[PDB]
Design a protein around this ligand. Structure first.
Ligand SMILES: Nc1ncnc2c1ncn2[C@@H]1O[C@H](COP(=O)(O)OP(=O)(O)OP(=O)(O)O)[C@@H](O)[C@H]1O
Ligand SMILES: [Mg+2]
Lengths: 155, 75, 422
C-alpha cells in the first residue's frame, strides 16, 4: 500500500492550455482554410505526442496539404493569442511573459532557413570538397600564427 | 598582414635578403588569398560554417515528459 | 537510494518475424526458444495432428505437409498461428493470469489481425496485460540509440523505418521485396542452369566424397510412403542456408575488372551437398550473387521475384533505397538519422556488404557524415527485436502503458486502444 510506487514520480505530463468552442470567438479573427476541427485535431495531437513536430505531422491525418511550418506557425499564434487573452485582466510576467516573447517567431524566416539548408546539402561534390580543403588549410595556417607574427615583426 | 604587406617592402629593400624573407612573403600572400576565397564563398551564401539561427520550442526545454524519463531508463 | 535500476515484471516477450519466432522471458538476455515460422500438418489418419517442435518436423512422415505462416511480416493463417503460440507457451511452462505479454510486430499490419490477436490474448489465454510495440522501435530499443534509421535486411522483406525520438514514422517506411528470398530464388535458378540436383538430407544413407562435377555415388534410403513437395522444399531451405552462409561475398562494383583474373587465380570453392557433389563456384558467380542485393541486374525475372517499387520502372537496390529514405527526411533531422544507421538482419553476416554500403552511401551523399552501426555479437544481429522487447518489458516507467483486459472491455473498440495505447 506504498502508494508512491516509484516511477509515478515521472508520470509528468506536459501542460498545454486548451480551447473549447466558446473560446473560438477569440480565435475567430485568426490555402490555409483553418477551422475549428483542424485546430482541435492539432491540439489533441500536440497533447498526446509531447510536441515532437515530425511525429505530429506524420500522425496527422486531416488533410495532407498541411506543411511543417504552417502547423508550427498556427500552433504558436493560437497559443500566444490564448495566453495574452489570459493575461489580459492580470498582467503576465516572469516565465510566462518570457514564453510570450519567444513566440514572436516568423514562418518565412524558417522556410528560408530550411531552403538554405537544403541548397547547401544539394551542392556538388567538388564545391564541398573545396570548402573542406579551405577549412583544413585555414586551420593549418591558424596553428602557427605566433611564429609567423614574430617573424613578421622581426622582418 | 594586410595593414602593411611585405611584398611592398621587399623590392624596396636596402639590406641583404634571405630565403626566409621570401618564405614569409609567400606565406602572407597565401593568407591573403585564402581569406579572399573565404569571403567570396561567404558572399555567395554557399558557406556551410554560416547558417541561420534555428527556432527553439519554449515548451520542450522546460519540463521533462514521461517519454524522456523512459528514454533515460532506456539508455 | 537513487532509482537508477529498472524493475522487471517476468513478462514474456514474443516475436513474429518473417522467418523465425523468438519467445523469451523479461529480464533475461537471450531467447529461450526460436522456432521457425512454419507449422507441420499430417492428415493420414481420420483425425488431425499438429507438429510444431522444430526437430520433429524434419523427419519424414507418411502424409505430411509444411505450410508457411509468416508471409511478409503480417500474421497469416491465424487459426494455426494461435495453435503455435499456445504450444510455444505450453513448452515454456508459462503461468497465465500473472505474467504480462509483450508482442512485437512489423511496421505494416492489418487492423483486423491486430484486433484478433489482442482478443485472443486477452479473452482466451487470459493474460492480464498486453502491448504491441512496433518492430523497428523495438530494434532501436535493443541497440540503445533512440534516434536512428533502422535498415532491416531480413529473409522476405527489406524494411527501412526512420525513427525519431524512439517512435517510428509510419508513412516514411520503404519496403522493398528484394531480400534473402531473392537471393534464394536467384541461387536456385543458378543451380538449375548448372544442372545440379540437390537431394534432401534424409535420403542420404551412405555416401562417399567425389569432387568431380559429374554424378556421385550416394546410397538412397527409400521409405514406403510418398514425400510431399513442401517437405522437400523445407529441407532444401536448410542447405541453401549453409550455402548462403559460406559461399557469398560482396565487392564494391569491381567485378568487371577482375572478371578475367578470377579464373586465372582459380580461387573457386566447393560446397558439398548431402549428395556429395562438390560443385565448384567461380568467384565471379559468388560476387555477382552477393552484389545482386545492391543492384538486381539479373534479367531472368528472378523466378517469381518480379519488379517491385517502394511499399510493395527498375528495382532500386539497397544503397539507392537508403539514399531515397534519407532524402525524404526533413533537413532538420536528416543528419541525426544519417549519423545513426542501425543495420540489423541475419543477411548482414555476408562479408563486405556493410562496408561497400557505407562506401556507396558516403560517396552518393557528400558532406553528410554517414556512419553505419552494426553488432559484433551474432546473437545481437539475429534477435535484436527480442532484445528490445525484453529491455522494454524490464523498464520501470513503461509499466504505465500496459493494456488491461478490463480496460479492453471498457473501451470495447480496438480502434481507440490501438491509436493511443498501441
Ligand atoms: N550467416 C547468414 N548469412 C546470410 N543469411 C543467413 C545467415 N544465416 C541465416 N541466413 C538466412 O538469411 C535469412 C535471414 O532471416 P532473419 O532471421 O534475419 O529474418 P526474420 O527473423 O524472419 O526477420 P525479418 O525478415 O523480418 O528481418 C533467413 O532465411 C536465414 O535462414
Ligand atoms: Mg522476418
Amino acid at each position: 500500500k506504498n502508494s508512491p510506487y516509484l516511477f509515478e514520480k515521472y508520470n509528468q505530463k506536459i501542460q498545454i492550455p486548451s480551447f473549447t468552442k466558446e473560446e473560438y470567438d477569440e480565435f475567430l479573427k485568426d490555402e490555409a482554410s483553418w477551422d475549428y476541427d483542424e485546430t482541435v485535431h492539432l491540439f489533441q495531437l500536440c497533447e498526446k505526442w509531447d510536441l515532437r513536430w515530425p511525429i505530429i505531422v506524420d500522425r496527422y491525418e486531416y488533410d495532407e496539404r498541411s506543411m511543417e511550418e504552417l502547423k508550427e506557425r498556427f500552433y504558436k499564434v493560437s497559443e500566444r493569442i490564448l495566453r495574452h487573452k489570459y493575461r489580459n485582466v492580470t498582467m503576465d510576467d516572469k516565465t510566462s511573459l518570457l514564453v510570450q516573447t519567444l513566440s514572436s517567431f516568423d514562418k518565412r524566416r524558417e522556410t528560408e532557413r530550411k531552403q538554405y539548408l537544403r541548397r547547401l546539402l544539394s551542392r556538388s561534390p567538388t564545391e564541398i570538397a573545396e570548402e573542406e580543403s579551405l577549412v583544413i588549410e585555414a586551420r593549418k595556417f591558424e596553428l602557427a600564427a605566433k611564429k609567423m607574427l614574430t617573424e613578421r615583426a622581426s622582418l | 598582414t594586410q595593414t602593411f604587406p611585405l611584398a611592398k617592402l621587399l623590392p624596396r629593400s636596402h639590406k641583404s635578403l634571405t630565403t626566409d624573407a621570401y618564405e614569409s612573403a609567400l606565406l602572407e600572400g597565401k593568407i591573403a588569398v585564402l581569406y579572399s576565397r573565404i569571403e567570396e564563398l561567404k558572399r555567395q551564401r554557399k558557406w556551410s560554417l554560416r547558417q541561420p539561427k534555428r527556432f527553439i520550442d519554449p515548451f520542450t526545454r522546460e519540463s521533462p515528459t514521461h517519454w524522456d524519463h523512459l528514454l533515460a531508463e532506456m539508455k | 537510494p537513487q532509482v537508477y535500476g529498472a524493475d522487471e515484471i517476468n513478462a514474456v516477450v514474443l516475436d513474429a518475424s518473417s522467418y523465425r519466432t523468438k519467445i523469451g522471458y523479461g529480464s533475461l538476455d537471450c531467447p529461450i526458444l526460436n522456432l521457425p515460422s512454419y507449422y507441420g500438418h499430417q492428415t493420414k489418419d481420420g483425425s488431425e495432428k499438429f507438429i510444431f517442435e522444430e526437430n520433429s518436423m524434419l523427419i519424414p512422415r507418411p502424409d505430411y505437409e509444411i505450410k508457411k505462416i509468416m508471409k511478409d511480416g503480417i500474421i497469416d493463417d491465424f487459426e494455426g498461428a494461435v495453435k503455435q503460440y499456445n504450444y510455444m507457451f505450453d513448452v515454456l511452462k508459462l503461468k497465465p493470469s500473472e505474467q504480462p505479454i509483450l508482442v512485437i510486430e512489423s511496421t505494416q499490419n492489418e487492423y483486423e489481425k491486430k484486433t484478433a490477436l489482442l482478443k485472443q490474448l486477452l479473452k482466451e489465454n487470459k493474460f492480464v496485460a498486453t502491448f504491441l510495440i512496433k518492430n523497428p522501435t523495438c530494434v532501436s530499443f535493443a541497440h540503445g540509440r533512440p534516434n536512428c534509421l533502422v535498415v532491416d535486411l531480413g529473409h522476405d522483406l527489406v524494411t527501412i523505418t526512420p525513427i525519431l525520438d524512439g517512435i517510428s514514422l509510419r508513412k516514411q517506411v520503404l519496403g522493398t521485396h528484394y531480400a534473402g528470398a531473392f537471393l534464394s530464388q536467384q541461387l536456385r535458378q543458378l543451380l538449375n542452369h548448372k544442372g545440379v540436383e540437390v537431394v534432401p538430407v534424409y535420403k542420404v544413407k551412405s555416401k562417399v566424397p567425389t569432387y568431380f562435377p559429374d554424378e556421385a555415388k550416394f546410397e538412397e534410403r527409400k521409405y514406403d510412403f510418398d514425400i510431399s513437395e513442401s517437405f522437400e522444399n523445407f529441407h532444401k531451405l536448410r542447405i541453401l542456408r549453409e550455402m548462403k552462409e559460406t559461399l557469398l561475398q560482396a565487392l564494391p562494383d569491381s567485378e568487371t575488372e577482375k572478371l578475367k583474373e578470377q579464373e586465372t587465380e582459380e580461387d573457386t570453392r566447393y560446397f558439398e551437398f548431402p549428395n556429395g557433389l562438390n560443385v565448384p563456384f567461380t568467384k565471379y558467380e559468388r560476387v555477382r550473387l552477393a552484389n545482386s542485393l545492391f543492384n538486381p541486374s539479373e534479367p531472368y525475372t528472378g523466378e517469381s521475384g518480379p519488379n517491385i517499387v517502394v511499399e510493395g520502372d527498375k528495382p532500386r537496390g539497397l544503397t539507392s533505397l537508403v539514399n531515397q529514405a534519407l532524402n525524404h527526411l526533413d533537413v532538420d533531422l536528416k543528419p541525426q538519422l544519417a549519423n545513426n544507421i542501425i543495420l540489423t538482419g541475419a543477411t548482414s553476416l555476408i562479408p563486405g556488404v556493410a562496408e561497400r554500403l557505407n562506401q556507396e552511401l558516403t560517396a552518393m551523399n557528400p558532406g553528410l557524415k554517414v556512419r553505419i552501426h552494426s553488432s559484433a555479437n551474432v546473437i545481437e544481429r539475429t534477435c535484436s527485436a527480442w532484445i528490445g522487447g525484453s529491455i522494454l518489458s524490464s523498464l520501470g516507467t513503461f509499466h504505465q502503458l500496459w493494456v488491461s483486459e478490463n480496460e479492453y472491455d471498457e473501451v470495447g473498440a480496438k480502434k481507440l486502444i490501438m491509436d493511443r495505447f498501441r
